[PDB]
């Protein structure tokens, strides 16, 4: 059967499922971006942009 | 005009103090041989400002504006007291009674809620 390192070659001649893989990758990246921001907001302290700016946090 | 409860109920006007015409710029004579009183005093806050806690390094805390969250429950009214005429000519109001406190919660940026007893007691 396919070795583990080749499972995604089943998309090479399947434009539809290639698009579906790409859509899923784009979803995961957009989701991360949303999740990361929400974590950052839950932990960010905005009270001092002088001595405790975001880059310190 | 002469309004009635049923005219006002639920409108938000029960929390508003009475107002005076743009043309009421006369003057009330004070007769120093006379005894005087405030028969109604009405205070209607319009803004609540809170001093931001100036950080350690500080420089100068400002009074920051706030969002009222407790609705139209803020006004002081039906306050009475005598108006004394002092002998240097000054007047002094000494509160006796009235609805002279309201609990009020405002909210600062970031979500800190700040309750306070908005009041003129005594
Ligand atoms: C756009 C980027 C991209 C894309 C679309 C592909 C696509 C593909 N690669 Mg290539 N490749 C890339 C980048 C990319 N690669 C890079 C940067 C490298 C260097 C590391 C390689 C090195 C490489 C090798 C050596 C091989 C492939 C192979 C393949 C094919 C099968 C892969 C498979 O089934 O994985 C299956 C993978 C798994 C079941 C699990 C992998 C688990 C990894 C190690 C950790 C996961 C990390 C995690 C998901 C974080 C995401 C990464 C982060 C950077 C975002 C497929 C056509 C194979 C091939 O040619 O077959 C014919 C193959 O032999 N790729
Ligand atoms: C963008 C990511 C991505 C996408 C679109 C696909 C898409 C595809 N894969 Mg690949 N795959 C991926 C990642 C991905 N895979 C990774 C990371 C692995 C390593 C496990 C594999 C391993 C893999 C195998 C072994 C096979 C496929 C197969 C397939 C196809 C059918 C779907 C399937 O069987 O899913 C199977 C894969 C998964 C269900 C991935 C599960 C990964 C989970 C979500 C990890 C999450 C861990 C957890 C949430 C951690 C949270 C934090 C922690 C604190 C708890 C399709 C082309 C099948 C195929 O057709 O090959 C011929 C197949 O047999 N893939
Ligand atoms: C009609 C013109 C047209 C337009 C506008 C696009 C536009 C796009 N193509 Mg290409 N494509 C075209 C013709 C076109 N294509 C043709 C003729 C072919 C050959 C069949 C391809 C084959 C092709 C492949 C194989 C792939 C693309 C991908 C993409 C997308 C990659 C960027 C992305 O996902 O952003 C991120 C997305 C967003 C920010 C949101 C997108 C929302 C838009 C506005 C679409 C809304 C729904 C719409 C009705 C669906 C039809 C989309 C359109 C591509 C037809 C992008 C939307 C890639 C893709 O789908 O990636 C996921 C991909 O895998 N295209
Ligand atoms: C330009 C940015 C970019 C690019 C080019 C890619 C490219 C890729 N990503 Mg995506 N990814 C990105 C940004 C990007 N990503 C971001 C910002 C996020 C959100 C954090 C994701 C989340 C994401 C997920 C969750 C998954 C991918 C996967 C993939 C691969 C799918 C094709 C495949 O089978 O590869 C074949 C695999 C390889 C070629 C291996 C690549 C090795 C890279 C360099 C990582 C090196 C090992 C890694 C560091 C070890 C992790 C250690 C840690 C767990 C302790 C491809 C390499 C999927 C994947 O790897 O499927 C198996 C997958 O599951 N990515
Ligand atoms: C629908 C449109 C849209 C909009 C308006 C935004 C807006 C934003 N995104 Mg989100 N995003 C979107 C879609 C969108 N996103 C999609 C579809 C995904 C899934 C992939 C994400 C995933 C995502 C991630 C992972 C992250 C964001 C982040 C951000 C923020 C910073 C953007 C930034 O720096 O980009 C910078 C982008 C670039 C520098 C792209 C450069 C493109 C290179 C140069 C390609 C050039 C190749 C081209 C073909 C050559 C052209 C030829 C030339 C001659 C013209 C901003 C609020 C960031 C953030 O703060 O998240 C919370 C972040 O980290 N976005
Ligand atoms: C969300 C994140 C999800 C990540 C999920 C996990 C990632 C996937 C798994 C990664 C681990 C890969 C294990 C594959 C391992 C395994 O399959 O190897 C053997 C395998 C043999 O491949 P063949 O071509 O023989 O295929 C037979 C097939 O059945 C394989 O599917 O070779 C490869 O995988 C090529 C790379 C060799 C890798 C060599 C590494 C071995 C080093 C051993 C020495 C260790 C250190 C000791 C020295 C001090």
């Amino acid at each position: 059967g396919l070795p583990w390192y080749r499972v995604h070659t089943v998309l090479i001649n399947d434009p539809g499922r290639l698009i579906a893989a790409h859509l899923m990758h784009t979803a995961l990246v957009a989701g991360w971006a949303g999740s990361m921001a929400l974590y950052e907001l839950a932990t960010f302290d905005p009270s001092d942009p002088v001595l405790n700016p975001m880059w310190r946090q | 005009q002469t309004l009635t409860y049923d005219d006002i109920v639920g409108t938000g006007l029960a929390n508003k103090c009475p107002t005076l015409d743009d043309t009421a710029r006369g003057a009330y004579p004070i007769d120093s041989s006379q005894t005087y009183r405030i028969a109604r005093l009405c205070l209607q806050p319009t803004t609540f400002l809170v001093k931001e806690e100036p950080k350690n390094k500080r420089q100068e805390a400002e009074f920051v504006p706030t969002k009222l969250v407790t609705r139209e429950t803020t006004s002081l009214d039906q306050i009475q007291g005598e108006l004394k005429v002092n002998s240097d000519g000054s007047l002094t109001f000494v509160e006796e009674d009235g609805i002279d406190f309201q609990p009020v919660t405002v909210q600062m940026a970031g979500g800190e809620r700040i309750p306070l007893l908005f009041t003129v007691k005594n």
Side-chain angles (χ1 to χ4, degrees):
Chain A
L2 282 169
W4 69 269
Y5 45 91
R6 289 187 197 163
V7 288
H8 293 163
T9 60
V10 299
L11 305 181
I12 295 189
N13 275 318
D14 199 332
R17 296 199 158 173
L18 180 75
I19 288 169
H22 286 176
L23 278 160
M24 190 57 70
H25 181 272
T26 306
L28 291 156
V29 180
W32 178 82
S35 292
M36 190 72 258
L38 281 185
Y39 178 83
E40 291 199 355
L41 289 176
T43 58
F44 179 52
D45 174 7
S47 58
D48 184 3
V50 181
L51 295 187
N52 190 24
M54 60 175 76
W55 47 269
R56 290 282 309 177
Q57 296 190 54
Chain B
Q1 267 253 329
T2 70
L3 288 176
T4 88
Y5 184 69
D6 287 330
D7 293 326
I8 270 165
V9 59
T11 69
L13 295 158
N15 200 43
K16 278 30 185 155
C17 291
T19 66
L20 286 182
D21 216 285
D22 274 343
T23 86
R25 297 196 68 259
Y28 193 75
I30 288 308
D31 172 1
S32 279
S33 85
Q34 191 79 46
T35 62
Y36 283 103
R37 63 186 278 87
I38 297 323
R40 173 189 187 185
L41 168 74
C42 186
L43 289 98
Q44 171 192 345
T46 63
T47 114
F48 295 89
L49 299 130
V50 179
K51 232 172 197 149
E52 46 173 22
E53 309 276 5
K55 233 94 224 91
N56 210 150
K57 71 289 176 65
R58 28 139 313 290
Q59 214 172 303
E60 173 45 47
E62 299 112 19
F63 266 91
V64 298
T66 66
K67 303 183 134 199
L68 173 70
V69 292
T70 45
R71 302 173 82 195
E72 289 299 305
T73 61
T74 66
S75 286
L76 311 188
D77 199 8
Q78 313 229 59
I79 292 167
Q80 306 169 4
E82 61 162 351
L83 189 68
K84 290 190 177 298
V85 202
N86 314 322
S87 45
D88 72 346
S90 66
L91 322 180
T92 296
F93 172 67
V94 160
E95 191 222 13
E96 292 174 31
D97 197 21
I99 305 167
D100 58 0
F101 67 99
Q102 295 290 349
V104 176
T105 301
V106 304
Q107 186 166 305
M108 276 162 56
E112 212 197 329
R113 285 144 172 200
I114 298 291
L116 77 127
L117 206 77
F118 173 52
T119 190
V120 292
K121 280 189 177 290
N122 307 113

